[PDB]
Symmetry: C2
Subunit: 208 residues, 2 copies
Amino acid sequence: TYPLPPNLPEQLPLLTNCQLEDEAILENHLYQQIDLPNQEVRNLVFRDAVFDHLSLANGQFASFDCSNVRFEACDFSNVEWLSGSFHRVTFLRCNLTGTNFADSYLKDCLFEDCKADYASFRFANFNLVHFNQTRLVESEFFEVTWKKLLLEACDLTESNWLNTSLKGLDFSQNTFERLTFSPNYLSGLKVTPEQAIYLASALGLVIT
Amino acid sequence: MKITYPLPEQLPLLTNCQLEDEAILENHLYQQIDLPNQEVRNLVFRDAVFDHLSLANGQFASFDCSNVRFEACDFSNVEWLSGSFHRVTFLRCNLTGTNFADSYLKDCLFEDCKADYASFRFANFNLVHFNQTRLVESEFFEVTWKKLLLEACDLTESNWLNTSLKGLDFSQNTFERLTFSPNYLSGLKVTPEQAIYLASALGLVIT
Ligand SMILES: [Cl-]
Ligand SMILES: [Cl-]
Ligand SMILES: [Cl-]
Ligand SMILES: [Cl-]
């Protein structure tokens, strides 16, 4: 089962500028080429919309609510989305470098061809979340609660999976040269022989 | 090379003998003696060599063995439960099903022995070396050990539950599979092929 895509019509009216205010709702448009760096805005609602080349770089968005939205080629580098809510959201070709989603709720979300090195999902709750062709080097998947999590064609090198169940995940279609994990949460992970050898070494086997 | 002193017409020969409770066999070369199906308590073998002794199917309560060479002896299906072994070498012995459960083995060597089904369950090892010894379906569970070495042994289907594998080297041995405790695995040295087995036994689903 794949995440549901955002519920969008074929045609949405185009806007090339927007303003952010606390409790503001941005909805029902295609928002294109907007550069709003270093903002701090509470209780934002983005819904039923597409954002194309939006930058919120170094933004801080408390109690963020996002539903039925596709973000395309957006810059969210270092953004704080602590305890955010994301439902039927796609991040496509987005810069998520250092983006902080700690404590967020993600349901029916897709990350496709994103740069997400150092991104944090610490304590996140996932339900139908798919990472596809997304770079996740030194990312944080610490104590994540999840159902129907899929990762394919992702670079997971040095990602942190401590306190997160790996039972029923398939890392065989991803790459990692290093991985941090909890030994008691390892059983049931699907891997290649090369990955198995790495994991066995990480568990303390001395392999010739 | 050993870190302890080696074992020494050097000894007078005996080619027959009888066993009785509390018997002490010492200071002889005992050779070609067939004594199967014995049940003898507090037997002592010491300062002696036994060449082609059979004790097949023997039952020995509180066996005590010290400074002894066993060469080409048959101990198949012997029970030496809670035995005491100090400075003992087993060379080309048949140890099929031999039961050492709960024994103490200090400075012992098993060289080129056939030891299918042999049990060391609950044993305590203190300087014990297995070399070129077949240990298929053997028991090594709940074993406490210091200076245990195994080399060129077949460990297929041996059982190591609740025995620490930290500091052991199985890479110089072979096994198709074996049973172990996950929490006792760290620090074992293995080949990649062995590691793949162990990884799958830990529940990794390997493509
Ligand atoms: Cl989409
Ligand atoms: Cl890999
Ligand atoms: Cl060893
Ligand atoms: Cl265990």
